[PDB]
Amino acid sequence: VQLVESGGGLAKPGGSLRLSCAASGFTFSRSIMHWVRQAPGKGLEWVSTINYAGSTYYADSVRGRFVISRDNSKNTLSLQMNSVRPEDRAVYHCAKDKEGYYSGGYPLWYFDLWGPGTPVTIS
Amino acid sequence: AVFLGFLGAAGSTMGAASMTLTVQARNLLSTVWGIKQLQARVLAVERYLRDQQLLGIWGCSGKLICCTNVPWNSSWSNRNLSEIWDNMTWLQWDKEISNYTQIIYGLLEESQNQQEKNEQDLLALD
Amino acid sequence: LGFLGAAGSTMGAASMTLTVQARNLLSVWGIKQLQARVLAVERYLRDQQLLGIWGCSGKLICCTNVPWNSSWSNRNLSEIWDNMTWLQWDKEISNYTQIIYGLLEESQNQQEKNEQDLLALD
Amino acid sequence: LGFLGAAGSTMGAASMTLTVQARNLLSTVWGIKQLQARVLAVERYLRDQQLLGIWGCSGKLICCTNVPWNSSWSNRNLSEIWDNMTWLQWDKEISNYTQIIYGLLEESQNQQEKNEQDLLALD
Amino acid sequence: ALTQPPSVSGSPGQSVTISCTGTSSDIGSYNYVSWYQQHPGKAPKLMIYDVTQRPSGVSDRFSGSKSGNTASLTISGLQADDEADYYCSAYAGRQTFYIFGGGTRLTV
Amino acid sequence: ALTQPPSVSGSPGQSVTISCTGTSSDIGSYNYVSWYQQHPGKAPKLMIYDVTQRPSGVSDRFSGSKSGNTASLTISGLQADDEADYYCSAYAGRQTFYIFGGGTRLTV
Amino acid sequence: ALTQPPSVSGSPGQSVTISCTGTSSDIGSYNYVSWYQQHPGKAPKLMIYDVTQRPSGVSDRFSGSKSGNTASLTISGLQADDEADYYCSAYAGRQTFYIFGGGTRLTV
Amino acid sequence: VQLVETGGGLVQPGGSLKLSCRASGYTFSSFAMSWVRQAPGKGLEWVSLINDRGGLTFYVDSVKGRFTISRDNSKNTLSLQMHSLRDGDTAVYYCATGGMSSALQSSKYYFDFWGQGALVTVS
Amino acid sequence: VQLVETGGGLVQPGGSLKLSCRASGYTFSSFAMSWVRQAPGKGLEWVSLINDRGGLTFYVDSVKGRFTISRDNSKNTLSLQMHSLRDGDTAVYYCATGGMSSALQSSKYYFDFWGQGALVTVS
Amino acid sequence: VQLVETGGGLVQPGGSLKLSCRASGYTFSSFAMSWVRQAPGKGLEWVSLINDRGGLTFYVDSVKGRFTISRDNSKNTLSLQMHSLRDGDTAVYYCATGGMSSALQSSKYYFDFWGQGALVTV
Ligand SMILES: *[C@@H]1O[C@H](CO)[C@@H](O[C@@H]2O[C@H](CO)[C@@H](O)[C@H](O)[C@H]2NC(C)=O)[C@H](O)[C@H]1NC(C)=O
Ligand SMILES: *[C@@H]1O[C@H](CO)[C@@H](O)[C@H](O)[C@H]1NC(C)=O
Ligand SMILES: *[C@@H]1O[C@H](CO)[C@@H](O)[C@H](O)[C@H]1NC(C)=O
Ligand SMILES: *[C@@H]1O[C@H](CO)[C@@H](O)[C@H](O)[C@H]1NC(C)=O
Ligand SMILES: *[C@@H]1O[C@H](CO)[C@@H](O)[C@H](O)[C@H]1NC(C)=O
Ligand SMILES: *[C@@H]1O[C@H](CO)[C@@H](O)[C@H](O)[C@H]1NC(C)=O
Ligand SMILES: *[C@@H]1O[C@H](CO)[C@@H](O)[C@H](O)[C@H]1NC(C)=O
Ligand SMILES: *[C@@H]1O[C@H](CO)[C@@H](O)[C@H](O)[C@H]1NC(C)=O
Ligand SMILES: *[C@@H]1O[C@H](CO)[C@@H](O)[C@H](O)[C@H]1NC(C)=O
Ligand SMILES: *[C@@H]1O[C@H](CO)[C@@H](O)[C@H](O)[C@H]1NC(C)=O
């Protein structure tokens, strides 16, 4: 039961970056997955989530720029970060939601499992 | 909680929002000050029963998704399945079809279940 | 045509307007309306509960496995459906209505549902 | 046995009297209390009917489901439930798991099942 | 199809019978075995409906019966005008509605 | 199964048709009669779907049609690379989902 | 019916195996393959039920098992009083309920 | 009561022929209608049955996918649409009243009123 | 447990026999009952199954339209009515107990009690 | 789009053999799939069909009690488990994409993509 991030790195103030995250010990077909970022001077910030039905939710600061997607066949979560800006510098962590009472796919936002995180630097 | 996820799919496509029909269903039922509360409780009951009665009349009692024998008329909406189920939400659909909702309901009663039950009465007869 | 329009019609012809009557069962000066609304709801639910316990939920016409007893009425079908109205029928068999209801409760639910409960394994 | 007469009976024997209890769920000072009693009886009856509807059990007193029994809810065999236990004892035993079972009945059937029937009736 | 004997025959004023034997599902399960009288060149006329019942306009000389899985039409008081092809028809069920036998040519 | 004529042929540059004959429950009732081209030793390729539609990637030399209970495929402008076994496949309801015809060898 | 080898034999004290081979729907689909021991002139007595279960009153020497679509009854410590026609009975479904094999005489 | 049947008498194999018979002397909409055929050298064979309303049709297997039975109660007209006529279909066809009844009527599992008939030859 | 058949044993082809079976030593109404037939030179064949209440009856296809299985739980009596007996029906008939259980009981897909099979000869 | 069967070889009559099919280049869970059989000297025969989710399975009557079609959408794998293989089942078994769609999608009563085929000899 782990999440391992890859991708990330350095990108220009108006470029793009892809992030990846591999799941190991859980069933990556019933889980709601979320990208959360920690900027050095701000603390943890939720970025986006995708539920098991493929519906996505975004934070206001990233909606229209980031795309969150999943591929169940590879147990992989990924984030396409378009039009990255200086305020997007952070360590990006993938997280899995605690399973609770059936909500029709609506997330709870309790982050049951976290990955080590991948650094993203904009410059 | 029963409230959790209520209307979460409202902005989702009609297909995706069709997977949450129990989430928006389970939250529909639950001095003058006292009278006002009794009227609100009775109204919630009356609206629930009117919708269940319509489902009964159409032969859809106890179902969240019910298939019928009423053909779709292109005069009501000429959109294809991708446009309706993958590229549209239920609020947008309701806005488009509200002018034809009473026609459709009238057909659901007149064009099928009244005839289907009278025919089933004759198939169980033999 | 219309609510109770078929009341003077034969039982056969009147059986075609069941939704016309069914749809009108749900729909000083302040408490009287609240009680009227509650009464309409309780009467509706008592009839729906009877339909439920007989295995007739969601139906206006419901066929059963209870045989008709000639002691309740010895008329043939022509004199019931073609030459009689529902008001006359209701009057003619009111004495046997509860007997029929008891039989419907016993054989259309208690026995049938246990049989279906067993057929779902074998 | 009359209303609740089977309360001390085993669950098996008590399951043949369900209509006896079902028939008794619907039916200034002393006026207001009477109206409140009537409204409360209607609301509770309908809450149970709403749950039966959601589970695909509308119009039935005995309803079979597609949700398997989880041995963590109770590890008793049928001879220790239906033949040697009452419904009051069972309710005491299944308390912490009632909402889990209800959520599973709501999700695993009459939602997924109706989509499956919607597709099966397509051909 | 049902099996009826062919080329049966009789004489004026006497009684004849035409048998029709079927399966337990076709005749043995339902009391709905009708008989028809078809004169050559004309459409069949209904003579017997149900196992033993007669349409109005048909004389008492034609009488139906059933035993086991076999139906029978008795024509008593045989007349010269009774020469015809007789058929039995049984109600078989919901999957198969009606099953007819072969024609019986009744001569006098 | 559906009936197709074997050994359909024509000269390079000409047109040919391949017939597919079924019953009313096979071709007549459903407008879902697809055609496949199978080169020996290879998997069949979808050439026509529905009565008249082509997949993307398929040239405009292939077309289909239906008349009554007979479906057909027409190839216009035969190439040396069209030598293949052609099959028709009809949707036949919920009890029998798909019925294929016999292979038609096309020679050029 | 299920297939069993006829005339299984052995000497007192040795173990024997009586196999029973069925199809995918009779034995491979359900763990309900009972075994019966029928002495000549007497009604069969139940020896094994489900696959590996034994009724009370039946000696430990009778032990059932299953592999694939083949069920087997192993009788260890074979006694002279074990000469009987042995049968396997599998539950096949609600259309065809029970399928019996032929008899296997244990020729001791 | 009288039923007069008209239509063509000769079609090529594989062709299509419609028969139609007008009824008078009774209420058309109150009775079920059937088609029965007799090969030139054989006995009677039941072909099809339509109820009194027209929504329920039944056919003998040998024609189940080829013949359509329909009625129009406003014109007192019964008709049979015959596609893919086979050599085995040469026969005199008759419209007849009866073959079933509604659940509110006495059983009518017989053909009471027979028409004049029409000879259909396939050649 | 004691099971005793009291039926007849000689009929002419086309005739009809009724075989009764008495049971004692257990609660009759708690068990399903079956009839199993063994031809004089053959193995065992399942013929019919009735549940513990008597409402559900099942037959082997070879007898499905000819035999009727019934049970009277007040008189502890099982019976099989065999009409149109064929030469192929000569056999010992055992009124074996078991073959199915209710949904509230463990699955009894076996015959646990047998006894005194009646021998029926058709000739 | 690529479909690759990774099945078996020679099996004895009455035995069992499971075939697998791997998919790539598209979302596996979005399409219905089927197995189609082709005997060495014959044409194509449809054997089984499974929907996109894997809850509804259909079989040709000749294999209804012998073959099981299943799909695991988290592994992009379609499989067919065959039991009691008979002599009439020797054939090339192709996996294919298409043959069914959901009620909210356009009809797809055709086989859109095909693999190369596993050879099963009984
Ligand atoms: C809110 O809208 C977004 C944007 O359309 C939806 O997500 C997109 O569409 C589908 C899922 O609906 C995915 O295939 C795309 O990759 C998504 N793209 C982006 C940029 O989000 C999303 O599903 C909607 N969410 C809800 C809860 O309705
Ligand atoms: C569709 O509706 C139009 C009017 O909006 C009506 O004239 C037409 O007959 C309808 N057609 C069908 C097939 O329902
Ligand atoms: C549906 O209509 C849209 C037009 O907005 C079109 O682009 C799309 O291709 C159509 N899809 C189908 C499946 O017909
Ligand atoms: C519905 O009808 C009104 C007029 O009554 C019209 O103004 C409106 O545009 C219509 N809307 C739709 C979606 O058809
Ligand atoms: C009233 O009775 C007359 C005479 O029988 C009948 O023609 C008419 O249809 C009846 N109308 C109603 C509404 O019952
Ligand atoms: C019919 O009712 C009478 C009494 O009214 C009763 O004695 C009789 O047994 C009943 N018969 C049937 C078949 O229900
Ligand atoms: C039923 O009984 C009445 C007696 O009042 C009789 O006149 C009528 O003809 C009967 N109906 C039938 C269909 O036999
Ligand atoms: C109470 O228990 C006794 C046995 O101790 C039992 O016979 C009786 O039926 C039980 N009462 C009820 C109402 O079940
Ligand atoms: C059920 O479990 C109890 C508890 O171990 C046991 O005593 C009893 O014999 C079991 N009954 C059955 C029928 O398995
Ligand atoms: C629920 O859990 C509590 C402990 O948290 C326990 O005391 C109680 O008995 C449980 N409820 C049951 C078994 O119904």
mmCIF file of all heavy atoms in Angstrom, chain E residues 27-40:
data_model
loop_
_atom_site.group_PDB
_atom_site.id
_atom_site.type_symbol
_atom_site.label_atom_id
_atom_site.label_comp_id
_atom_site.label_asym_id
_atom_site.label_seq_id
_atom_site.Cartn_x
_atom_site.Cartn_y
_atom_site.Cartn_z
ATOM 1 N N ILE E 27 -54.900 -32.356 -25.928
ATOM 2 C CA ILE E 27 -56.279 -32.660 -25.562
ATOM 3 C C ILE E 27 -56.423 -32.955 -24.075
ATOM 4 O O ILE E 27 -57.396 -32.528 -23.449
ATOM 5 C CB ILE E 27 -56.835 -33.817 -26.431
ATOM 6 C CG1 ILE E 27 -56.947 -33.336 -27.887
ATOM 7 C CG2 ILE E 27 -58.185 -34.360 -25.898
ATOM 8 C CD1 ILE E 27 -57.391 -34.371 -28.908
ATOM 9 N N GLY E 28 -55.483 -33.697 -23.491
ATOM 10 C CA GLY E 28 -55.630 -34.089 -22.102
ATOM 11 C C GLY E 28 -55.513 -32.949 -21.112
ATOM 12 O O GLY E 28 -55.968 -33.091 -19.972
ATOM 13 N N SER E 29 -54.920 -31.824 -21.518
ATOM 14 C CA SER E 29 -54.702 -30.698 -20.617
ATOM 15 C C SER E 29 -55.773 -29.617 -20.680
ATOM 16 O O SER E 29 -55.886 -28.846 -19.723
ATOM 17 C CB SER E 29 -53.346 -30.047 -20.910
ATOM 18 O OG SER E 29 -52.280 -30.930 -20.619
ATOM 19 N N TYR E 30 -56.549 -29.527 -21.764
ATOM 20 C CA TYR E 30 -57.541 -28.466 -21.902
ATOM 21 C C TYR E 30 -58.860 -29.018 -22.417
ATOM 22 O O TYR E 30 -58.876 -29.843 -23.334
ATOM 23 C CB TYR E 30 -57.051 -27.395 -22.881
ATOM 24 C CG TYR E 30 -55.692 -26.825 -22.559
ATOM 25 C CD1 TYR E 30 -54.554 -27.318 -23.177
ATOM 26 C CD2 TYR E 30 -55.547 -25.799 -21.642
ATOM 27 C CE1 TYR E 30 -53.312 -26.808 -22.890
ATOM 28 C CE2 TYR E 30 -54.305 -25.280 -21.350
ATOM 29 C CZ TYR E 30 -53.192 -25.789 -21.976
ATOM 30 O OH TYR E 30 -51.952 -25.274 -21.688
ATOM 31 N N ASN E 31 -59.964 -28.551 -21.832
ATOM 32 C CA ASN E 31 -61.298 -28.931 -22.298
ATOM 33 C C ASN E 31 -61.778 -27.959 -23.379
ATOM 34 O O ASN E 31 -62.819 -27.316 -23.254
ATOM 35 C CB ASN E 31 -62.265 -28.965 -21.119
ATOM 36 C CG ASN E 31 -61.930 -30.049 -20.117
ATOM 37 O OD1 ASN E 31 -61.549 -31.157 -20.489
ATOM 38 N ND2 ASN E 31 -62.078 -29.735 -18.834
ATOM 39 N N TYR E 32 -60.993 -27.857 -24.457
ATOM 40 C CA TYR E 32 -61.295 -26.973 -25.587
ATOM 41 C C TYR E 32 -61.057 -27.716 -26.901
ATOM 42 O O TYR E 32 -60.165 -27.330 -27.658
ATOM 43 C CB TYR E 32 -60.467 -25.682 -25.536
ATOM 44 C CG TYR E 32 -60.601 -24.896 -24.255
ATOM 45 C CD1 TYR E 32 -59.493 -24.609 -23.477
ATOM 46 C CD2 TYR E 32 -61.835 -24.427 -23.833
ATOM 47 C CE1 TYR E 32 -59.610 -23.893 -22.308
ATOM 48 C CE2 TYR E 32 -61.961 -23.707 -22.669
ATOM 49 C CZ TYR E 32 -60.845 -23.440 -21.912
ATOM 50 O OH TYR E 32 -60.970 -22.720 -20.747
ATOM 51 N N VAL E 33 -61.840 -28.758 -27.185
ATOM 52 C CA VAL E 33 -61.689 -29.503 -28.433
ATOM 53 C C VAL E 33 -62.967 -29.314 -29.238
ATOM 54 O O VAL E 33 -63.993 -29.947 -28.965
ATOM 55 C CB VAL E 33 -61.396 -30.990 -28.195
ATOM 56 C CG1 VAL E 33 -61.179 -31.724 -29.522
ATOM 57 C CG2 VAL E 33 -60.181 -31.167 -27.298
ATOM 58 N N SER E 34 -62.900 -28.434 -30.229
ATOM 59 C CA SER E 34 -64.025 -28.098 -31.083
ATOM 60 C C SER E 34 -64.059 -29.029 -32.295
ATOM 61 O O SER E 34 -63.062 -29.668 -32.637
ATOM 62 C CB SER E 34 -63.930 -26.631 -31.495
ATOM 63 O OG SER E 34 -62.797 -26.405 -32.297
ATOM 64 N N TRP E 35 -65.219 -29.080 -32.961
ATOM 65 C CA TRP E 35 -65.394 -29.838 -34.197
ATOM 66 C C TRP E 35 -66.024 -28.965 -35.268
ATOM 67 O O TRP E 35 -66.971 -28.216 -34.984
ATOM 68 C CB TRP E 35 -66.269 -31.071 -33.988
ATOM 69 C CG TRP E 35 -65.659 -32.096 -33.110
ATOM 70 C CD1 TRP E 35 -65.693 -32.138 -31.750
ATOM 71 C CD2 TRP E 35 -64.931 -33.251 -33.532
ATOM 72 N NE1 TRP E 35 -65.022 -33.246 -31.296
ATOM 73 C CE2 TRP E 35 -64.551 -33.950 -32.372
ATOM 74 C CE3 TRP E 35 -64.579 -33.771 -34.780
ATOM 75 C CZ2 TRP E 35 -63.825 -35.133 -32.423
ATOM 76 C CZ3 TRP E 35 -63.852 -34.938 -34.828
ATOM 77 C CH2 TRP E 35 -63.488 -35.611 -33.658
ATOM 78 N N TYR E 36 -65.561 -29.154 -36.511
ATOM 79 C CA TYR E 36 -66.024 -28.413 -37.677
ATOM 80 C C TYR E 36 -66.513 -29.357 -38.768
ATOM 81 O O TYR E 36 -65.959 -30.444 -38.955
ATOM 82 C CB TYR E 36 -64.888 -27.572 -38.261
ATOM 83 C CG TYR E 36 -64.318 -26.608 -37.269
ATOM 84 C CD1 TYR E 36 -63.217 -26.967 -36.515
ATOM 85 C CD2 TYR E 36 -64.872 -25.357 -37.068
ATOM 86 C CE1 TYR E 36 -62.675 -26.117 -35.610
ATOM 87 C CE2 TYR E 36 -64.322 -24.486 -36.162
ATOM 88 C CZ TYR E 36 -63.230 -24.879 -35.422
ATOM 89 O OH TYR E 36 -62.676 -24.049 -34.483
ATOM 90 N N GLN E 37 -67.529 -28.906 -39.512
ATOM 91 C CA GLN E 37 -68.104 -29.619 -40.656
ATOM 92 C C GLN E 37 -67.867 -28.797 -41.917
ATOM 93 O O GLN E 37 -68.417 -27.698 -42.050
ATOM 94 C CB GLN E 37 -69.598 -29.870 -40.457
ATOM 95 C CG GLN E 37 -70.294 -30.566 -41.617
ATOM 96 C CD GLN E 37 -71.723 -30.942 -41.291
ATOM 97 O OE1 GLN E 37 -72.018 -32.089 -40.960
ATOM 98 N NE2 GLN E 37 -72.623 -29.969 -41.374
ATOM 99 N N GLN E 38 -67.065 -29.323 -42.842
ATOM 100 C CA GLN E 38 -66.718 -28.645 -44.087
ATOM 101 C C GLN E 38 -67.272 -29.416 -45.278
ATOM 102 O O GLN E 38 -66.847 -30.546 -45.540
ATOM 103 C CB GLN E 38 -65.202 -28.507 -44.220
ATOM 104 C CG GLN E 38 -64.744 -27.781 -45.489
ATOM 105 C CD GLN E 38 -63.244 -27.614 -45.561
ATOM 106 O OE1 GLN E 38 -62.491 -28.530 -45.239
ATOM 107 N NE2 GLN E 38 -62.800 -26.447 -46.007
ATOM 108 N N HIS E 39 -68.236 -28.828 -45.978
ATOM 109 C CA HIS E 39 -68.735 -29.478 -47.176
ATOM 110 C C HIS E 39 -67.761 -29.125 -48.300
ATOM 111 O O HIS E 39 -67.169 -28.042 -48.268
ATOM 112 C CB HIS E 39 -70.141 -29.008 -47.523
ATOM 113 C CG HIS E 39 -71.167 -29.364 -46.495
ATOM 114 N ND1 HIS E 39 -71.640 -30.648 -46.334
ATOM 115 C CD2 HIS E 39 -71.810 -28.608 -45.574
ATOM 116 C CE1 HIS E 39 -72.526 -30.669 -45.354
ATOM 117 N NE2 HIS E 39 -72.652 -29.443 -44.880
ATOM 118 N N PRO E 40 -67.510 -30.024 -49.261
ATOM 119 C CA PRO E 40 -66.570 -29.675 -50.337
ATOM 120 C C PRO E 40 -66.963 -28.384 -51.043
ATOM 121 O O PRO E 40 -68.126 -28.175 -51.399
ATOM 122 C CB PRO E 40 -66.655 -30.879 -51.276
ATOM 123 C CG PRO E 40 -67.032 -32.003 -50.400
ATOM 124 C CD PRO E 40 -67.969 -31.421 -49.385
#
